[PDB]
């Protein structure tokens, strides 16, 4: 009983109203964009390597 | 290699003139320390050496070209005009060039692309 009551008192202190209008989705979208960029670059690079290999016969 | 002699000597004369140009250049920059730089003298000497080399080279190529290896030459007038292996090597070269141009185009596209993105938001 004592521990749970103390927890409830603390939770009142934090007071936890409406949800936190906090989101990390912006940085996530940006970082996914960067990963997609490096993916496109690596893809096209694999392609140009294939081409130069062919020519290099 | 006769026409080779002609062209190489031609280029040696340009090399003569350009070496003289840079020699006077180096002389102009000279400083007469007031310093102890001394690297100037090094470049001057080892530069002057190449000139000496090229002169003997020119004498040699001149001799070999006016050697006149059995040639009954006609005067320039009437020359102004008023083998399969060549074809094969030319064809192979043109093909390799085309492939190189595909490669260059691919790289161009990649560079345009990477530029578009980063410059858009980086």
Spatial separation of the C-alpha atoms in residues B108 and B26, rounded to whole Å: 41
Q: Find out whether B66 and A11 touch, Cβ atoms under 8 Å.
A: no
Residues of chain A with Cβ-Cβ distance to B102 below 8 Å are 51, 55
Tokens linked to B76: 């320039």
Other C-beta atoms closer than 10 Å to the C-beta of B102 total 14
Rg of chain B taking only CA atoms, in angstroms: 26
Spatial separation of the C-alpha atoms in residues B108 and B96, rounded to whole Å: 18
Q: Taken in order A17, A18, A21, A22, is the CA torsion positive or negative?
A: positive
A46 touches chain B (CB under 8 A): no
User: Which technique was used to obtain these atomic coordinates?
Assistant: cryo-EM
B window 47-106, beta carbon within 8 A of A: 96, 99-100, 102-103, 106
Spatial separation of the C-alpha atoms in residues B6 and A29, rounded to whole Å: 67
Through-space distance between the first and last CA atoms of chain A, rounded to whole angstroms: 82
Torsion of CA B20, B26, B27, B30, to 10 degrees: 180
Residues 6+ apart with CB under 8 A from B6: B65
B121 touches chain A (CB under 8 A): yes
Tokens linked to B111: 């560079």
Residues 6+ apart with CB under 8 A from B52: none
Spatial separation of the C-alpha atoms in residues B14 and B64, rounded to whole Å: 19
Residues of chain B with Cβ-Cβ distance to A41 below 8 Å are 110, 114
Distance from CA of B112 to the nearest CA of A (A): 11
Q: Find out whether B44 and B27 touch, Cβ atoms under 8 Å.
A: yes
CA A46 to chain centre: 26
Distance from CA of A35 to the nearest CA of B (A): 12
Spatial separation of the C-alpha atoms in residues B88 and B92, rounded to whole Å: 6
Spatial separation of the C-alpha atoms in residues B51 and B57, rounded to whole Å: 10
- Residue B76 is given by DSSP the state S
Tokens linked to B38: 């001394």
Spatial separation of the C-alpha atoms in residues B109 and B104, rounded to whole Å: 9
Write the burial class of residue B29 (CB in 10 Å: 0-12 exposed, 13-18 middle, 19+ buried): exposed
Give resolution, Å, one decimal. 4.8
Through-space distance between the first and last CA atoms of chain B, rounded to whole angstroms: 57
Closest C-alpha to A48, from B17, B119, B33, B110: B110
Helix (H, G, I), strand (E, B) or coil at B93: helix
Helix (H, G, I), strand (E, B) or coil at B30: coil
Q: Find out whether A45 and B110 touch, Cβ atoms under 8 Å.
A: yes
- Where would I find the H helices in chain B? 2-29, 39-65, 84-121
């Amino acid at each position: 009983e004592a521990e749970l009551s103390a927890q409830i008192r603390y939770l009142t202190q934090v007071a936890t109203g409406q949800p936190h209008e906090g989101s990390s989705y912006s940085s996530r979208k940006d970082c996914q964009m960067a990963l997609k960029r490096v993916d496109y670059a690596r893809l096209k690079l694999s392609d140009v390597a294939r081409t130069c290999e062919q020519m290099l016969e | 290699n006769t026409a080779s002699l002609c062209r190489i000597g031609q280029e040696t004369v340009q090399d003569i003139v350009y070496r003289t140009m840079e020699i006077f250049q180096l002389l102009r920059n000279m400083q007469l320390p007031n310093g102890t730089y001394q690297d100037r003298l090094t470049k001057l000497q080892d530069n002057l050496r190449q000139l000496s080399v090229l002169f003997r080279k020119l004498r040699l190529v001149y001799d070999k070209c006016n050697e006149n290896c059995g040639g009954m030459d006609p005067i320039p007038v009437e020359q102004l005009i008023p083998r399969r292996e060549i074809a094969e090597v030319n064809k192979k070269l043109k093909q390799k060039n085309q492939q190189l141009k595909q490669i260059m185009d691919q790289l161009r596209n990649l560079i345009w692309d990477i530029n578009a993105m980063l410059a858009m938001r980086n």
